[PDB]
Amino acid sequence: KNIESLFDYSAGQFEFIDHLLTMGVGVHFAALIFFLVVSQFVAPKYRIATALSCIVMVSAGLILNSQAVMWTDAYAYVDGSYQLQDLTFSNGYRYVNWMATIPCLLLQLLIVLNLKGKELFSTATWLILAAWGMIITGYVGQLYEVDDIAQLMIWGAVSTAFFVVMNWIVGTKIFKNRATMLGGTDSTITKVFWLMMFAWTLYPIAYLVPAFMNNADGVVLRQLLFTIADISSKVIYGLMITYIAIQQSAAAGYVPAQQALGRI
Ligand SMILES: *C\C=C(C)/C=C/C=C(C)/C=C/C1=C(C)CCCC1(C)C
Ligand SMILES: CCCCCCCC/C=C\CCCCCCCC(=O)O
Numbered sequence: 226k227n228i229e230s231l232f233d234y235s236a237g238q239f240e241f242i243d244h245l246l247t248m249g250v251g252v253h254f255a256a257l258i259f260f261l262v263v264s265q266f267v268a269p270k271y272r273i274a275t276a277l278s279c280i281v282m283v284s285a286g287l288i289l290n291s292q293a294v295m296w297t298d299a300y301a302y303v304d305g306s307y308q309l310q311d312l313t314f315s316n317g318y319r320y321v322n323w324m325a326t327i328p329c330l331l332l333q334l335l336i337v338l339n340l341k342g343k344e345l346f347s348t349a350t351w352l353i354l355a356a357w358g359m360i361i362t363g364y365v366g367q368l369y370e371v372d373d374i375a376q377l378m379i380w381g382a383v384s385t386a387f388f389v390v391m392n393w394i395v396g397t398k399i400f401k402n403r404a405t406m407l408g409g410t411d412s413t414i415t416k417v418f419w420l421m422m423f424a425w426t427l428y429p430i431a432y433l434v435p436a437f438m439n440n441a442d443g444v445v446l447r448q449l450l451f452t453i454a455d456i457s458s459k460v461i462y463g464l465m466i467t468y469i470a471i472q473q474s475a476a477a478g479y480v481p482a483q484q485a486l487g488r489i
């Protein structure tokens with residue numbers, strides 16, 4: 226149902242996608258280890274945000290590692306190309322993790338914005354229905370990424386709207402609660418907002434590969450645009466979300482965070 230099943234791959238194409246996903250496993254699980262160790266230097270009120278990235282990291286992780294195994298399961302070298310065998314590959318399982326990866330990030334962004342209580346829970350509930358929104362219409366479109374490209378843009382169209390709509394929430398929150406933010410991180414938080422519009426725009430581009438490049442190199446590009454969007458919303462966004470909590474933790478008087486920052 227997917228363009229990936231349409232082609233045979235040269236060995237270079239196939240080894241490259243495999244090294245991509247594998248390098249992408251190496252990284253979520255090695256970011257995973259950093260996010261563990263620095264969690265002791267984060268104040269009790271921010272510490273779930275570091276932890277949440279421990280989850281992001283295992284979750285893109287598993288599916289990423291899972292895509293790499295299914296890649297080598299699905300294809301074998303026959304007569305000079307890698308050809309599809311008995312099992313399929315697909316990015317279908319990538320959109321389900323998006324289901325889980327985002328609320329969590331959205332959650333760690335909300336946590337360091339210093340949202341609390343009813344605004345925090347409320348804004349989490351809306352944010353989560355919205356991207357969940359964006360995510361599932363994404364899902365249903367790529368379903369027709371071979372049979373019915375009209376549903377790709379049309380479902381593309383729909384999921385985009387949600388993406389616009391949700392950025393609006395996040396941005397409003399971010400620029401509203403800049404002034405609560407301690408240690409200089411009111412400057413930093415606007416940067417993440419920006420970074421975050423890059424990694425998540427890689428996605429629609431990654432989602433129009435069949436419309437505009439329905440061949441084997443588009444399959445590869447699509448995965449390439451997957452590893453960076455991936456590394457950026459999960460790993461770099463993550464890295465960047467960690468620094469604000471430690472900074473704000475030292476600003477609020479958390480001596481392990483002070484000591485950690487002063488050590489560097
Ligand atoms: C792990 C984190 C993220 C932020 C993955 C995000 C996916 C998107 C921002 C993609 C949205 C869609 C667009 C708007 C285009 C139509 C189909 C998609 C779901 C890929
Ligand atoms: C922030 C960085 C994102 C991660 C970078 C992803 C990995 C960079 C990979 C190398 C790009 C150039 C390789 C060109 C290979 C040609 C593909 C082919 O063999 O057919």
Ligand SMILES: CCCCCCCC/C=C\CCCCCCCC(=O)O
Pocket residue numbers: 247248250251252255256259460464
């Ligand atoms: C089998 C995996 C192959 C790739 C080798 C793994 C090594 C990856 C190296 C760095 C991971 C990228 C993230 C950087 C670590 C973040 C911690 C820090 O801020 O210093």
Ligand SMILES: [Cl-]
Pocket residue numbers: 268269270271
């Ligand atoms: Cl605290």
Ligand SMILES: [Cl-]
Pocket residue numbers: 284285288319322323326
């Ligand atoms: Cl994912």
